Amino acid sequence: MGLFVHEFFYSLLLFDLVYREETLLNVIKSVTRNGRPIILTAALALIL
């Protein structure tokens, strides 16, 4: 998506390079592991 392909994206590559950073990955984790059925605890309020 910049070979000859349109604008943007470049942004996407930046996002994943920073993801490849771990420590931020550790803090990122501070939101998925006990989160995989806790996206379901969102709809609690969305129903409440």
Binding site: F8, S11, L12, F15
Partner: peptide, 19 residues
């Protein structure tokens, strides 16, 4: 946040005149 600027901005130009 920085991407979802664009994700809006592509399908929706800001369409802003006054606050």
């Amino acid at each position: 946040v920085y991407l979802f600027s664009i994700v809006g901005y592509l399908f929706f130009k800001d369409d802003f005149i006054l606050e």
